[PDB]
Nucleic acid binder design. Structure first.
Ligand SMILES: OC[C@H]1O[C@@](CO)(O[C@H]2O[C@H](CO)[C@@H](O)[C@H](O)[C@H]2O)[C@@H](O)[C@@H]1O
Ligand SMILES: *Nc1ccc2c(c1)Cc1ccccc1-2
Length: 580
DNA sequence: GGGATGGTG
DNA sequence: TGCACCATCCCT
């Protein structure tokens, strides 16, 4: 039976109560400068639906929206805040965000709409957004009556579910995680996305022309070596030229056919000159398609800025993710791809890009959590951790660590952090099997605390059903007891890795909150632009660099207090690329 | 729509 | 490889 509500023509006083569930609907996935198709309000006085044109043009409503003393409960408040920012309207007083609450309670549920969240508490008096709006081409805003009842039902669910969700968070000891970390963070992310990052489009296009030339030359040399033309971008067609026409050996197979991964090509290079050209083609093409063309495609012509969206409720570990464009995977490893960063510039004249990153936060966190004496001491001496690990597992002095030894010790360190389960590890060839086990065994001898942690965390995941991070974030691991080898293994690696990666996420998130509070106290113009897991990127007047050199590192290093110190390096320059 | 590929921490 | 992600490209 339909849900009762007032389809208002104008804003009334009872619509501006001091507490309410609010829905400011933005249907476009990318909410930047997007339309708000409708508004719904549910409070002690009743349920209302308001048309955006009138609601957002109503001085009293706009003031209510900006009154921090007028509390609102919402779902994905960042989406509303940003869409409103593009309209010059400030949203304040959001005391509860159902999306963030659901995420903290169980990130595995993949909650991405009110219906999904409500279903967690056996509430189903609301439809999933996809059912209302459709998907892909079919997607569209329905007629007012249908739209209005949907937004009212979503608001009604929020109104009803706030208490139950808050009580469970309290039980889980996640109440402060929501109110003091994720929600305040939501506001900061909104400012970051709204501000955007300036792009030197001319530079990007010039690189594009050059890549097109080199690419043209390479693809031609390839057809020459292959004795025919074909779609090099097709792993299937390329696999036919390589493993059939040229007779190259099949070292790796895929659940489809011939594997042509870079690592596989790396091994085939000695057999024929075409391989290197394929690799070169792959490198240039990746840059052209994803980082030149793909990027230019999302730059706003009027401002030359890109406004990413930081999904704060997706990763299973508590990390953020970035989309359209993804600004968390801009090239840096290879010098040629690194050039791309020269296109990311300050949004104003005489401003500079400032980047600060934690040094080995995962291993420092691991040292803290595992309480390993050897590992904690290593960091207390601020030692090169990879060289130190090499010395221990290979039993040699610092002077005896060769480049390959350090490289191998580094791979071991990533392995420990990713989770050494009883069903992977090896690929990088060279004996593997018994020896890989011997090195890991050597490692656990040098770091007994880490061994204890790995065993304990797995046992704890099985006993409690989940693992937790420093700030009480959790991840349920039901497969921890699966009788399927492979499936159980994944869960074990997750139990070992999540507290590490997740705690690192907790720390940088608090640092962001602490940092913004400091920047405001200091009256600095500097502001956050991006977060890339263990680093923060900002821009500010050149006059502020010196203060930032002392302020940012300090704030980030002091976000939390661990058994080992936290270390943050920093760089700044005229472009993202120069901030090295 | 799925997999294959490759970009980041 | 093994942890956590996202975008482009084929191809059914
Ligand atoms: O607003 C981001 C927020 O919305 C969700 C759905 O509740 O994701 C939507 O928006 C993203 C940004 O455009 C898209 O990538 C995604 O496909 C779309 O469903 C949440 O996952 C997210 O936290
Ligand atoms: N995931 C992973 C696990 C173990 C090991 C590596 C990666 C590289 C390596 C080298 C030597 C011994 C053990 C491992």
């Amino acid at each position: 039976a339909a849900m009762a509500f007032t389809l208002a023509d104008r804003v009334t006083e009872e619509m501006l109560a001091d507490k309410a569930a609010l829905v400011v609907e933005v249907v476009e996935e990318n909410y930047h400068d997007a339309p708000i198709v409708g508004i719904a309000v549910v409070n002690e006085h009743g349920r209302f639906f308001l048309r955006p044109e009138t609601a957002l043009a109503d001085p009293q409503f706009v003031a209510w929206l900006g009154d921090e003393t007028k509390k609102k409960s919402m779902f994905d408040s960042k989406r509303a805040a940003v869409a409103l920012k593009w309209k010059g309207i400030e949203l304040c007083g959001v005391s509860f965000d159902l999306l963030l609450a659901a995420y903290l309670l169980d990130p595995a549920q993949g909650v991405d709409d009110v219906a999904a969240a409500a279903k967690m508490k056996q509430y189903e008096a609301v439809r999933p957004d996809e059912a209302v709006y459709g998907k892909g081409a079919k997607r569209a805003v329905p007629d007012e009556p249908v739209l209005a009842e949907h937004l009212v039902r979503k608001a009604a669910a929020i109104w009803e579910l706030e208490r139950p969700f808050l009580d469970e968070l309290r039980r889980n000891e996640q109440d402060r995680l929501l109110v003091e970390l994720e929600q305040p963070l939501s506001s900061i992310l909104a400012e970051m996305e709204f501000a955007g990052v300036k792009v030197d489009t001319k530079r990007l296009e010039q690189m594009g022309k050059e890549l097109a030339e080199q690419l043209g030359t390479v693809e031609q040399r390839i057809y020459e070596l292959a004795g025919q033309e074909f779609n090099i971008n097709s792993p299937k067609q390329l696999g036919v030229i390589l493993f059939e026409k040229l007779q190259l050996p099949v070292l790796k197979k895929t659940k489809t056919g011939y594997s042509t991964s870079a690592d596989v090509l790396e091994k085939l290079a000695p057999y024929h000159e075409i391989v290197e050209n394929i690799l070169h083609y792959r490198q240039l093409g990746k840059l052209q398609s994803t980082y030149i063309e793909g990027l230019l495609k999302v730059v706003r012509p009027d401002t030359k800025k890109v406004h990413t969206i930081f999904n704060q409720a997706l990763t299973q570990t508590g990390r953020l993710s970035s989309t359209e464009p993804n600004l968390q995977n801009i090239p840096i490893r290879l010098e040629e791809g690194r050039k791309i960063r020269q296109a990311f510039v300050p949004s104003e004249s005489d401003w500079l890009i400032f980047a600060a990153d934690y040094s080995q936060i995962e291993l420092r966190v691991l040292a803290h959590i595992a309480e390993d004496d050897n590992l904690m001491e290593a960091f207390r001496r601020d030692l090169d951790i990879h060289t130190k690990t090499a010395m221990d597992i290979f039993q040699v002095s610092e002077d005896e660590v060769t480049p390959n030894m350090r490289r191998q010790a580094k791979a071991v360190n990533f392995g420990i952090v990713y989770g050494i389960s009883d069903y992977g590890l090896a690929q990088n060839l060279n004996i593997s099997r018994k020896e890989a086990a011997e090195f890991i065994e050597r490692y656990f001898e040098s770091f007994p605390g880490v061994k204890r942690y790995m065993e304990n965390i797995v046992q704890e995941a099985k006993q409690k059903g989940y693992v937790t991070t420093l700030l009480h974030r959790r991840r349920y691991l039901p497969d921890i007891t699966s009788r399927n080898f492979n499936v159980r293994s994944f869960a074990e690696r997750m139990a070992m890795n999540t507290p590490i990666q997740g705690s690192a996420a907790d720390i940088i998130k608090k640092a962001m909150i602490d940092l913004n509070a400091r920047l405001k106290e200091e009256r600095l113009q500097a502001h956050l632009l991006l977060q890339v897991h263990d680093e923060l990127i900002l821009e500010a007047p050149k006059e502020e660099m010196e203060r930032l050199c002392r302020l940012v590192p300090e704030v980030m290093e002091q976000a939390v207090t661990l058994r080992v110190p936290l270390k943050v390096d920093y760089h700044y320059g005229s472009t993202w690329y120069d901030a090295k």
